[PDB]
Amino acid sequence: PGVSVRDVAAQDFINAYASFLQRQGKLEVPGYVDIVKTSSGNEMPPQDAEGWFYKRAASVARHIYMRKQVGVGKLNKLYGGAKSRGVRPYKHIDASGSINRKVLQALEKIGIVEISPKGGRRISENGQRDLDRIAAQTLEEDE
Amino acid sequence: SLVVQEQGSFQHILRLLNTNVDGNIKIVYALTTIKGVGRRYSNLVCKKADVDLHKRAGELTQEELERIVQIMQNPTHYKIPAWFLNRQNDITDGKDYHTLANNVESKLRDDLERLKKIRAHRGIRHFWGLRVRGQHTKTTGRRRA
Amino acid sequence: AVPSVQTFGKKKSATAVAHVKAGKGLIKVNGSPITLVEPEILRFKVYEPLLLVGLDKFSNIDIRVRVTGGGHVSQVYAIRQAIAKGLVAYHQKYVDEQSKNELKKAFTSYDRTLLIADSRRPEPKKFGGKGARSRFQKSYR
Amino acid sequence: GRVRTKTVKRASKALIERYYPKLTLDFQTNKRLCDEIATIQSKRLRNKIAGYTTHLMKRIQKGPVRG
Amino acid sequence: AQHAVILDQEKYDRILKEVPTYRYVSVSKIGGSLARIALRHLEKEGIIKPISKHSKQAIYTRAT
Amino acid sequence: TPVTLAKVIKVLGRTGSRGGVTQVRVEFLEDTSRTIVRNVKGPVRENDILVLMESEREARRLR
Amino acid sequence: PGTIVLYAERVQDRGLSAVAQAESMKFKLLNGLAIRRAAYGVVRYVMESGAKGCEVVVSGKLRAARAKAMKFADGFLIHS
Amino acid sequence: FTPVVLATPIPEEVQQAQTEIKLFNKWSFEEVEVKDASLVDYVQVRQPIFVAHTAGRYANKRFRKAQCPIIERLTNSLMMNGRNNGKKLKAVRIIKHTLDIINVLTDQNPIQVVVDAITNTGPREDTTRVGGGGAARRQAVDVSPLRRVNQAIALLTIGAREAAFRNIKTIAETLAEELINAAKGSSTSYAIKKKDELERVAKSNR
Amino acid sequence: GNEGAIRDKTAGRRNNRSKDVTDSATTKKSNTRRATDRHSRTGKTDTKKKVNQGW
Amino acid sequence: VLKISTRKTPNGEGSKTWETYEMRIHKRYIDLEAPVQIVKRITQITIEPGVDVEVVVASN
RNA sequence: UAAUUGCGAUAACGAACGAGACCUUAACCUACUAAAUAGUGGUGCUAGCAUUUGCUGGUUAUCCACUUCUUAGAGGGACUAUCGGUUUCAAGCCGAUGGAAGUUUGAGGCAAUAACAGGUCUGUGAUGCCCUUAGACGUUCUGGGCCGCACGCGCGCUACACUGACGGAGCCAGCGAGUCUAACCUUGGCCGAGAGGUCUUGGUAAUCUUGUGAAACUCCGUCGUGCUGGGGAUAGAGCAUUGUAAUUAUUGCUCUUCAACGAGGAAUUCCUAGUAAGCGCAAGUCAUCAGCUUGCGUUGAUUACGUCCCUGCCCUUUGUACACACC
Ligand SMILES: [Mg+2]
Ligand SMILES: [Mg+2]
Ligand SMILES: [Mg+2]
Ligand SMILES: [Mg+2]
Ligand SMILES: [Mg+2]
Ligand SMILES: [Mg+2]
Ligand SMILES: [Mg+2]
Ligand SMILES: [Mg+2]
Ligand SMILES: [Mg+2]
Ligand SMILES: [Mg+2]
Ligand SMILES: [Mg+2]
Ligand SMILES: [Mg+2]
Ligand SMILES: [Mg+2]
Ligand SMILES: [Mg+2]
Ligand SMILES: [Mg+2]
Ligand SMILES: [Mg+2]
Ligand SMILES: [Mg+2]
Ligand SMILES: [Mg+2]
Ligand SMILES: [Mg+2]
Ligand SMILES: [Mg+2]
Ligand SMILES: [Mg+2]
Ligand SMILES: [Mg+2]
């Protein structure tokens, strides 16, 4: 037929890119993913913990695909959630600016995002075909 | 995961580090009945000592245990950074420690009586048993004195 | 240049802008097929315009919609509205009236604000309490 | 709940007093009379003057009524 | 810490012959956590009929 | 258990002190064009229907 | 210098715009006029000067240590 | 069932459930009949719709609240206690959940056993607070045929709402364990309890 | 000094929960001329053929 | 819409009544096509006191 | 009737202020005017998957067309319309249909006459009089204080969890504001766990910050009823930022410490539809500081559609020796 990312269910697609990138091997994770809280605004780190860089490095790009470009900032806002300041009211704060700044580079060295002009990080042309093989794989779920 | 059903390896209670632990509770979540322990300082260490959190407490055969503590009794020879712990620069030898024992109760007093010995205004507060950090004290904190 | 219209749909802040091509029957909200937009229980709320008017009813048209503004439900009510009027505006220009009046009559005899654009709207707060009608708690000395 | 003010009521009887050849039993006609026959100041205002005049006219074609 | 919230070997026997006779199934012997994905250790084999779909409430039913 | 068929002919007005009630004359769907009226708690329109336990009983207005 | 200069335009029939008449009483009561006289003066001026209506309020104290307040009004006045 | 297929994929699943005989996503809107003569005309089943979320003005006029799809007016009666004011989309999901359960054991049409769950929690008679003079009695009153249902549904939720508090069992299951007893009242339901004793003292007075 | 402040026993919430609150803590507005207001207390009046000379 | 929200009272007594003020602004551009001598023909009767007028060229 | 709003009765007839009108705001226009500082379709130029021609993007102008969306101009539109039920078959009210709208269309703005020893001399270079005026009550400078803590009262914030916290992941608003003699709103590239830092850039603004990717909320997991992973007070140790100055800890992060609080007695508050309630956001304040307020949108009920019992207040009648008017 001809598939595209738009044609596929958000969470059982992005978590298929997880199983893909988990069992591919070229990651360049900064090494310091044993601790980080994924923002000030979070209580505890992700629980997958052999992984969840891939599950972030799956939603890393499906967002980068669907849009012209983004920067390190706009991702901090995206994932950054409410922070319970204990007894004070909840607030939104931005997520961590480095766990994002080179999940981007870590998988632009793998060549799926391009350091866009106008400022930002456009989807790579090759990543644009680590596109619809994306979920041709996952349309195989209900083939 | 998937179910598995093991032998009478599993023991309900075992004390360690001068503290008890339920067997039927999680072994990345019991683990916090010691002092100086956080859900976070502890989460980290476990598969830093190559153990899989997903399973229970009277589990997880002793050998690791003998030196899961070696990673908290000795946490920077074993690769955990000196902003993750409760005493940096500590006050008087510039070192960076963690304290997890009855010694956390202790190391409170060490500094508590420091400021007392030194006449520091925040000692004086503490000696008088008040709020120290500059909270308004008229309307608040009244009956648990 | 093929026979095609535009319509819209409005739920309170959301507006849903619908273009109905004469095509081979495609329905993709914002690039993506209607198949799943996941406020997923609320899916059938935008599945229904198809099912009410009979689904077949699509095999020389082509629909796709964008939604600015709104909220995770303010839009889902604005699209199903935006598409029903779409398909009825198609049946205004290009096919007859009786074949049109059968849908606005099949729609309004169920309509969940499907063609009449729901009029409700946030009321402005007045000083004296955080809330439209609410007042602060009072003392009585 | 709007009983209409007499500013409108006083006027509506002041024209049925003098325009019955005109003053159709329909509003939209009656509306578009007063733009030309009266010097009212706002759409809203004349709409209930005309909207009233009509309702009187409906009833004089049933009997009389005071005024 | 009450009533046996881990594998509890002879528990794994009762689970075997308790699955019939049930028109219902849910996380409601057991402690909650070990129940949760006990569940689809069961549809490994034809124990069940998963008439539910999703998380925070699950409903299987008798093998048919 | 003896129950009753009661449809409201038309209805009177709010009795009771704070006004939450109303006498409602009603028609017996068995042996119709009947007597008595009873009264309510909930909001009611005309045409309604409702059970009574004892139909050989009516109180008058509420104090 | 030159970025502005300023020119003097007398005010048409000043007794319609208030500050002209407002200030007018100020210099009447400051020259010893009876409060009722001066006020009634401006109000009858303001009327023969064209206005459809007029009104003046005097508030405060005149030699009685408790403050009174009179109103002086002619003609028509909408307020809503 | 004369299937129609085209570019965007639509299940045989929902292309099987459309204007052939209209039931809910999974359950029949026909065959739900009130087994109480009264509450005809005041429990809107039949006209159908398959998920309960309707942007319908139901209180701008007095009684339009009554032609509300009733299982909807059940559902907003869970978005309650502040904690849950909002959460409709959460709400709608526990009913979908609560409704796959009841076919747990009761073969019966689920939106049948709810209409049998509110039938038998309608407090046909009640009491008042007569002015009466000082220490005055209660007056035997007869609730309306829609304060019956509004009291029925609120009585049904509030008791499962407190059943699910402090305990593992899901608000889907408490609501589920409530309607089955409420389907024909048997001896446990918080709702029929509060009903009988909101009626047995309509008899303390006569 | 601060040596003063610690040493002099004199002090601390312990030395203060020891004791009892003066009941004047718990007491009211006491209303301090809000029943007398309408009656001028200046002990003075304004003449009538002086007010007539003002107004 | 330039809003000013302020308590009405000079002091802090009374029921706490606020009052939004408003100042409303209208700014219109029009793109032109003209010669180098009507530069100053619509400049001078182009005014009515109250309207700030600004015209210079660009695409730069 | 919301209304001295009207009908009607009528020694009164006919009017004005105030109510209404009006003004503003939020809802309706495929009808007028059209806009690369708003956007739609086509087409150039272009990327990917499938191929059969398609589907999804890229492209500060590559061109061409348009105004549905957006905007703000001019109009129009509703007048409780039609019909019916009710009623002195009056003013009116109620039901249905139609309708963007039929609760003063929703929300405000304005608002007569009178009253108060209501508050404001601590907003005013408004002001009378009184007090002080060089060992000053003027004025500035240094440091402290307004935060002081046995307790009583009130506006609030976070909670006692399983309609939950948590962890991923889905990921949607709207009212604003924003830098010249400048240091304002900040994108983007790095370095940092974080806070932050640093290198540049757009913007005097529908042009850039910004689709403000906000938060509740939706998904999938881990937890299991146990003061538990709910809860986050108190507290130690460290790193940052604002600022001449952070001690009595300005604010931010990190680790650790892990209380009360297991639904609240007597009492009492607010509220009838996109309202209540939960949710977060901008603005004011502002060097730094929101648990405050002023606006905004997000998700969206229950139960009324009544009465005068409570309470309050208006209104007649009536008594009055009060009129400085029951202080
Ligand atoms: Mg977010
Ligand atoms: Mg998130
Ligand atoms: Mg909190
Ligand atoms: Mg809040
Ligand atoms: Mg601990
Ligand atoms: Mg007027
Ligand atoms: Mg337009
Ligand atoms: Mg209608
Ligand atoms: Mg006074
Ligand atoms: Mg002053
Ligand atoms: Mg002064
Ligand atoms: Mg103070
Ligand atoms: Mg207050
Ligand atoms: Mg969550
Ligand atoms: Mg570092
Ligand atoms: Mg605990
Ligand atoms: Mg917590
Ligand atoms: Mg409560
Ligand atoms: Mg601020
Ligand atoms: Mg303040
Ligand atoms: Mg008298
Ligand atoms: Mg007295």
Coordinates of N, CA and C (backbone and C1' of nucleotides) in Angstrom, one line a residue, chain F residues 42-43 49-51, chain H residues 36-40 42 118-119 121-125 142-155, chain K residues 304:
Chain F
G42 N -39.9 14.8 45.0 CA -39.2 15.3 43.8 C -39.9 16.3 43.0
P43 N -39.2 16.8 42.0 CA -39.8 17.6 40.9 C -40.7 16.8 40.0
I49 N -46.5 9.3 36.8 CA -47.0 8.0 37.3 C -46.2 7.7 38.5
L50 N -46.8 7.0 39.5 CA -46.0 6.6 40.7 C -46.8 5.7 41.6
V51 N -46.1 4.8 42.3 CA -46.7 3.9 43.2 C -47.1 4.6 44.5
Chain H
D36 N -40.3 -1.7 35.7 CA -41.2 -1.0 36.6 C -42.0 -0.1 35.8
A37 N -43.4 -0.1 36.0 CA -44.3 0.6 35.2 C -43.9 2.1 35.2
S38 N -44.0 2.8 36.3 CA -43.3 4.0 36.5 C -41.8 3.9 36.3
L39 N -41.2 4.9 35.9 CA -39.8 5.0 35.3 C -39.9 4.6 33.8
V40 N -41.0 4.1 33.3 CA -41.3 4.4 31.9 C -41.2 6.0 31.8
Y42 N -38.9 8.0 32.0 CA -37.9 8.7 32.7 C -36.5 8.0 32.8
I118 N -31.3 0.3 39.1 CA -31.9 1.6 39.6 C -33.4 1.4 39.8
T119 N -34.0 0.5 39.1 CA -35.4 0.1 39.5 C -35.5 -0.1 41.0
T121 N -33.7 0.6 43.6 CA -33.2 1.6 44.6 C -33.9 2.9 44.5
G122 N -35.1 2.9 44.1 CA -35.9 4.1 44.0 C -36.8 4.2 45.2
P123 N -36.5 5.1 46.1 CA -37.1 5.2 47.4 C -38.6 5.6 47.3
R124 N -39.5 4.7 46.9 CA -40.8 5.1 46.5 C -41.5 6.0 47.5
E125 N -41.3 5.7 48.8 CA -41.7 6.6 49.9 C -40.5 7.0 50.8
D142 N -43.9 10.7 49.1 CA -43.7 9.8 48.0 C -42.9 10.5 47.0
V143 N -41.6 10.0 46.8 CA -40.7 10.7 46.0 C -41.2 10.7 44.5
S144 N -40.7 11.6 43.7 CA -41.1 11.7 42.3 C -40.6 10.5 41.5
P145 N -41.1 10.4 40.2 CA -40.5 9.3 39.3 C -39.3 9.8 38.6
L146 N -38.7 10.9 39.0 CA -37.3 11.2 38.6 C -36.4 11.6 39.8
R147 N -36.9 12.1 40.9 CA -36.1 12.0 42.1 C -35.8 10.6 42.5
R148 N -36.7 9.7 42.1 CA -36.5 8.3 42.3 C -35.2 7.9 41.6
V149 N -35.1 8.2 40.3 CA -33.9 7.7 39.6 C -32.6 8.5 40.0
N150 N -32.7 9.9 40.1 CA -31.6 10.6 40.6 C -31.1 10.1 42.0
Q151 N -32.1 9.9 42.9 CA -31.7 9.2 44.2 C -31.2 7.8 43.9
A152 N -31.8 7.1 43.0 CA -31.3 5.7 42.7 C -29.9 5.7 42.3
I153 N -29.5 6.5 41.3 CA -28.1 6.5 40.8 C -27.1 7.0 41.8
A154 N -27.4 8.1 42.4 CA -26.5 8.7 43.4 C -26.3 7.7 44.6
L155 N -27.4 7.1 45.0 CA -27.3 6.0 46.1 C -26.5 4.9 45.6
Chain K
rA304 P -33.4 17.1 41.7 O5' -33.7 18.6 42.2 C5' -33.4 19.7 41.3 C4' -33.5 21.0 42.1 C3' -34.6 22.0 41.6 O3' -35.9 21.6 42.1 C1' -32.6 23.1 41.9

